[PDB]
Amino acid sequence: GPPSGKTYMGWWGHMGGPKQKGITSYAVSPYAQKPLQGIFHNAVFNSFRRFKSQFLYVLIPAGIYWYWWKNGNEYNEFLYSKAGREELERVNV
Amino acid sequence: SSLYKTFFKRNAVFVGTIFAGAFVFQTVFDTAITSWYENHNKGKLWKDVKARIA
Amino acid sequence: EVTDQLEDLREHFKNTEEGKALVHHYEECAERVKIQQQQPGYADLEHKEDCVEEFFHLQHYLDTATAPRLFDKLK
Amino acid sequence: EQAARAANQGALPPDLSLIVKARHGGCDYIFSLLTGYPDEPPAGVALPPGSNYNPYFPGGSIAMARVLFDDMVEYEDGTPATTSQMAKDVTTFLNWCAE
Amino acid sequence: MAFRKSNVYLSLVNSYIIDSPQPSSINYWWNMGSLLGLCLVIQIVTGIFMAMHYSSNIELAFSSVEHIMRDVHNGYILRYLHANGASFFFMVMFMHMAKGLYYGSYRSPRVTLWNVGVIIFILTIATAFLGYCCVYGQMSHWGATVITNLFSAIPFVGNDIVSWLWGGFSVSNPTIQRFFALHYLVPFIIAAMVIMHLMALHIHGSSNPLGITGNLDRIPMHSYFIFKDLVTVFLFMLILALFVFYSPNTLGHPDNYIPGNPLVTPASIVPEWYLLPFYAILRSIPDKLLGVITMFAAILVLLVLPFTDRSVVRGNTFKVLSKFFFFIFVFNFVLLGQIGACHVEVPYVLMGQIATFIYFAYFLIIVPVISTIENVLFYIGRVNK
Amino acid sequence: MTAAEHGLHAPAYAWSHNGPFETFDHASIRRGYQVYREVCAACHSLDRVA
Ligand SMILES: CCCCCCCCCCC(=O)OC[C@H](COP(=O)(O)OC[C@H](O)COP(=O)(O)OC[C@@H](COC(=O)CC)OC(=O)CCC)OC(=O)CCCCCCCC
Ligand SMILES: CCCCCCCCCCCCCCCCCC(=O)OC[C@H](COP(=O)(O)OCCN)OC(=O)CCCCCCCCCCCCC
Ligand code: HEM
Ligand code: HEM
Ligand code: HEM
Ligand SMILES: COc1c(O)c(C)c(C/C=C(/C)CC/C=C(\C)CC/C=C(\C)CC/C=C(\C)CC/C=C(\C)CCC=C(C)C)c(O)c1OC
Ligand SMILES: CCCCCCCCCCCCCCCCCC(=O)O[C@H](COC(=O)CCCCCC)COP(=O)(O)OCCN
Ligand SMILES: CCCCCCCCCCCCCCCCCC(=O)O[C@H](COC(=O)CCCCCC)COP(=O)(O)OCCN
Numbered sequence: 192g193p194p195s196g197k198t199y200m201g202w203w204g205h206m207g208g209p210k211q212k213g214i215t216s217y218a219v220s221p222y223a224q225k226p227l228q229g230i231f232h233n234a235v236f237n238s239f240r241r242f243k244s245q246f247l248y249v250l251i252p253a254g255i256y257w258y259w260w261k262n263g264n265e266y267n268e269f270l271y272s273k274a275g276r277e278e279l280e281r282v283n284v
Numbered sequence: 285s286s287l288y289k290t291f292f293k294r295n296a297v298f299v300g301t302i303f304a305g306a307f308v309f310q311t312v313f314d315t316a317i318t319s320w321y322e323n324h325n326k327g328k329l330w331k332d333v334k335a336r337i338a
Numbered sequence: 339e340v341t342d343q344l345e346d347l348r349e350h351f352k353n354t355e356e357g358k359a360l361v362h363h364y365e366e367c368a369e370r371v372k373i374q375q376q377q378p379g380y381a382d383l384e385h386k387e388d389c390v391e392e393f394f395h396l397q398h399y400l401d402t403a404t405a406p407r408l409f410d411k412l413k
Numbered sequence: 414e415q416a417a418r419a420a421n422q423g424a425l426p427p428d429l430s431l432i433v434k435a436r437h438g439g440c441d442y443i444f445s446l447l448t449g450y451p452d453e454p455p456a457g458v459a460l461p462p463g464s465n466y467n468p469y470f471p472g473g474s475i476a477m478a479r480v481l482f483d484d485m486v487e488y489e490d491g492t493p494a495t496t497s498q499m500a501k502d503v504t505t506f507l508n509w510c511a512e
Numbered sequence: 513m514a515f516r517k518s519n520v521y522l523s524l525v526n527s528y529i530i531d532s533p534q535p536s537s538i539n540y541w542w543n544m545g546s547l548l549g550l551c552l553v554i555q556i557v558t559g560i561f562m563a564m565h566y567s568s569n570i571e572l573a574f575s576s577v578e579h580i581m582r583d584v585h586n587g588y589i590l591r592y593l594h595a596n597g598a599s600f601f602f603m604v605m606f607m608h609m610a611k612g613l614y615y616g617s618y619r620s621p622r623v624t625l626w627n628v629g630v631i632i633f634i635l636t637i638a639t640a641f642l643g644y645c646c647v648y649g650q651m652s653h654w655g656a657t658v659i660t661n662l663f664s665a666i667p668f669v670g671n672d673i674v675s676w677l678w679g680g681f682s683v684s685n686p687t688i689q690r691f692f693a694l695h696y697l698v699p700f701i702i703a704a705m706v707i708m709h710l711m712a713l714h715i716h717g718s719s720n721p722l723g724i725t726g727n728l729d730r731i732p733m734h735s736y737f738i739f740k741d742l743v744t745v746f747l748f749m750l751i752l753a754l755f756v757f758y759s760p761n762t763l764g765h766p767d768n769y770i771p772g773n774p775l776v777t778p779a780s781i782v783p784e785w786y787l788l789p790f791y792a793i794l795r796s797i798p799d800k801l802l803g804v805i806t807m808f809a810a811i812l813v814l815l816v817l818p819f820t821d822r823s824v825v826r827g828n829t830f831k832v833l834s835k836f837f838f839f840i841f842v843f844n845f846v847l848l849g850q851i852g853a854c855h856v857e858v859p860y861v862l863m864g865q866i867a868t869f870i871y872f873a874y875f876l877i878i879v880p881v882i883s884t885i886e887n888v889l890f891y892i893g894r895v896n897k
Numbered sequence: 898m899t900a901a902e903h904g905l906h907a908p909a910y911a912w913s914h915n916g917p918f919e920t921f922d923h924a925s926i927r928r929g930y931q932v933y934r935e936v937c938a939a940c941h942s943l944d945r946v947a
Contacts, residue, residue: 206533260847263863271898283858325919328923341483371456390458394905401445405911428944429943430944430946440912469907472901480936502926506933
């Protein structure tokens with residue numbers, strides 16, 4: 192077939208990024224490393240840092256929507272009781 | 285030292301040991317679960333009731 | 339010789355401190371319904387008072403005390 | 414179904430092969446229904462003719478009447494056949510019919 | 513060259529699951545799309561093995577599903593794995609889509625990939641509805657009644673498309689026989705949308721949680737992301753097995769074990785749990801015609817999101833205000849499901865009218881306004897004048 | 898709705914088949930069929946059991 196429209200990604204040898212000069216990388220084999228020394232000092236010390244950074248953006252919305260749900264229940268509980276029969280008659284019509 | 289050149293090196297060693305070892309795992313694994321299940325619920329089963337009213 | 343087990347527990351917990359109060363709140367309320375439609379205006383009135391809620395309050399408590407105990411007495 | 418209603422004052426008794434799975438509560442509801450008939454309804458409720466009070470039934474008025482009284486069967490193995498005992502067995506038998 | 517690169521058929525497998533270049537920093541949220549491919553394989557296989565014992569006639573349908581549960585060897589495993597498998601299929605899709613909302617995967621150059629996804633979501637709601645009716649329980653009969661009668665409000669063609677869907681004058685035997693035949697078909701249309709979906713991903717690749725280019729650091733798929741996908745596959749099967757073998761009727765309704773009876777109505781007619789947010793948007797509008805338009809608009813409003821995001825940064829990683837309002841939208845979607853499982857009663861009518869405004873206002877008023885604010889907040893915090 | 902229209906909540910008894918490792922008590926099933934044949938079967942069917 193023919194070539195198609197060009198993209199923002201290529202393949203191995205020509206990936207389309209900028210040219211690199213002056214960066215050096217080092218590594219070691221897995222067979223030469225001690226087994227999984229990365230589970231602990233990571234499930235307590237690091238996992239707590241990750242929790243403390245982001246828990247405020249979830250729990251303030253959750254607190255708003257859960258408080259709104261309970262006040263709706265308790266009011267519906269009350270309207271269909273014997274004490275809340277007179278208020279049920281008004282807010283319907 | 286020799287625990288690789290005959291036990292792991294090949295993988296006609298290790299497809300054959302895996303597939304062959306999977307069959308004896310099932311028959312041994314099933315007998316052990318079925319014995320623990322029936323002993324944990326002994327007295328409730330039918331064979332225990334049938335043995336109490338002959 | 340052996341009477342039913344659930345009435346023995348239902349009667350025992352009606353002497354509970356919580357069980358003594360929930361009885362009389364249902365009774366005093368039964369005496370109120372004796373009159374309110376006995377008066378004229380029998381079936382043309384808009385509504386009239388039952389005592390279903392006071393009966394549910396006693397029954398619900400009596401059921402949370404006898405449920406975890408009963409099946410140890412049955413065979 | 415025409416003959417079933419003719420013998421029960423218009424109400425139809427359902428099939429019980431799936432009653433444990435087709436009700437909210439399961440085995441706890443079937444048992445409490447049978448042991449839950451009071452001997453006099455609460456003050457105020459006016460029952461239609463041919464119905465009985467059971468507070469576990471939605472509405473509080475059910476066409477079935479009480480059918481379990483003490484020592485109406487004699488068991489082979491010799492267990493005392495009280496009201497609570499017979500109820501525990503039918504609800505265990507009927508769950509096996511569903512599962 | 514290697515044989516896997518020169519052969520016509522293996523070259524496609526190599527280019528997609530072996531040598532495909534991937535960003536090194538993608539996290540476990542990028543594993544949900546492989547699970548959705550396993551879900552579709554589970555459903556198509558289990559359903560074909562049940563279809564050998566099923567009967568679609570309205571007098572035989574309910575009793576044929578019980579014949580599968582009692583008489584067929586390993587038949588209760590087939591069904592419960594099928595009924596609970598669909599609830600797991602929808603839960604992984606809500607997480608897949610919410611991921612794209614967060615990291616900006618809908619933006620250019622991946623707009624066409626996001627639009628083919630919205631088509632898959634429509635075809636999967638349709639498939640699940642048609643199969644719930646093949647049971648012909650009490651919820652199966654009255655759910656098809658109230659949904660097919662919504663197309664009666666379309667002006668001048670409403671009463672003719674309903675009699676054409678039903679094949680008569682009510683939900684009846686032509687209705688159940690045609691719902692089963694369409695239900696086998698549509699899963700194979702979904703499988704072709706998935707092929708088109710992957711083709712649109714191969715030309716630009718995946719994004720990453722930082723929202724910048726990934727062409728500077730790439731690793732291949734084989735033995736890094738094949739074995740990272742294997743971690744979540746065995747967790748999926750473990751949690752599914754716990755539901756199929758220990759709690760197989762917790763995510764369903766009891767009234768569907770009663771056979772369908774058109775003379776007796778149930779006290780509460782509700783769908784499955786995953787159509788409840790959309791069932792509550794319908795009841796919020798007090799006019800019949802406008803409620804049907806609004807229910808469908810709630811699915812097609814996802815298509816205007818590439819145009820209302822006015823940010824020069826991709827994703828919500830470095831955005832304070834867009835993080836807070838992403839989670840307002842999530843918990844508003846859960847409250848819509850709760851409202852849809854309640855009675856039409858005070859105050860559950862006003863609660864569902866305010867919460868359906870917050871659903872449409874997020875896409876159209878909130879995103880373009882705070883995205884403009886965040887652009888200008890980055891500028892003045894750095895530039896000295 | 899009103900509590901009388903929804904019905905009373907059935908309590909939680911301790912059934913011997915509750916739990917992930919427990920079976921039915923098969924002496925109660927046999928004992929329970931006797932209660933079906935002599936009380937219930939006058940007015941109830943069991944059409945799906947062979
Ligand atoms: C009902 C049907 C569901 C069945 C499918 C279940 C799969 C759901 C997965 C949802 C998800 O994608 O959340 C991903 C998020 C992790 O984000 P991350 O890449 O930064 O963490 C990498 C980790 O640190 C390295 O962990 P590592 O690579 O070393 O090992 C992974 C292993 C856990 O290892 C441990 O012993 C503890 C470290 O297994 C797994 O973690 C399995 C994956 C859950 O998970 C989190 O831990 C935090 C987010 C909580 C999500 C809750 C909301 C969803 C409802
Ligand atoms: C059509 C509309 C579809 C909408 C469907 C909505 C329901 C979908 C439920 C899933 C919502 C969450 C999926 C989207 C989140 C993906 C991104 C993410 O991970 O969340 C951001 C947060 C922190 O991630 P970071 O900022 O650190 O990113 C860099 C990571 N290396 O990571 C987190 O902290 C995740 C915390 C999630 C907690 C909220 C759980 C939501 C489930 C509520 C269930 C309520 C009971 C049913
Ligand atoms: C131990 C014996 C019995 C058991 C366990 C039993 C079980 C049940 C159950 C579970 C229901 C349905 C309740 C509901 O839907 O909430 C029912 C309904 C009914 N049963 Fe029974 N049954 C028994 C015996 C009888 C007998 C002897 C009769 C004789 C007339 C009878 C007549 C009815 C009727 C008329 C209904 C319909 C209730 C209504 O529509 O209001 N039952 N039964
Ligand atoms: C995307 C794929 C599929 C989805 C999401 C899906 C969904 C469903 C659902 C939700 C039900 C009702 C479950 C219940 O409560 O019993 C159902 C029933 C059924 N489906 Fe599927 N289905 C899919 C594929 C298939 C296929 C390909 C077949 C092939 C015949 C099939 C055959 C059946 C049958 C026979 C039933 C009725 C038996 C039963 O109730 O389990 N399904 N389907
Ligand atoms: C049967 C249903 C689906 C299947 C099998 C599927 C499959 C996949 C796969 C394998 C990926 C690449 C890996 C990944 O990003 O997790 C992907 C990415 C993506 N999917 Fe889906 N998908 C499905 C449904 C959807 C839906 C419903 C949407 C949106 C409405 C969607 C939108 C996207 C987007 C935007 C991406 C790219 C994310 C990124 O690169 O950051 N897909 N899909
Ligand atoms: C981002 O990196 C990725 C990536 O991580 C992944 C996983 C994939 C691959 C992802 C997928 C989701 C795979 C696609 C899966 C499908 C399209 C599912 C298709 C499923 C079918 C067509 C079902 C086939 C089932 C049968 C034929 C049933 C057989 C039944 C029999 C034999 C029973 C016999 C009896 C009767 C009555 C017929 C990528 O393409 C990719 O991009 C590079
Ligand atoms: C959208 C539909 C899916 C399209 C296909 C994509 C998914 C790939 C399918 C799965 C891959 C398996 C392909 C087998 C690889 C070997 C092919 C091969 O050896 O090519 C052929 C022989 O293949 C055959 O005999 C028929 C193939 C049967 C296909 C089985 C269904 C060898 O031909 P070769 O490339 O060596 O050159 C000619 C030398 N005489
Ligand atoms: C009969 C069973 C069906 C199986 C075959 C599937 C074909 C269904 C077509 C689905 C259309 C998908 C459109 C969603 C994306 C829209 C956004 C976009 O810009 O993409 C569209 C993609 O459109 C198509 O996919 C149709 C091409 C035919 C496919 C032949 C393999 C841009 O391309 P296109 O030019 O085709 O659309 C604009 C028309 N001027």
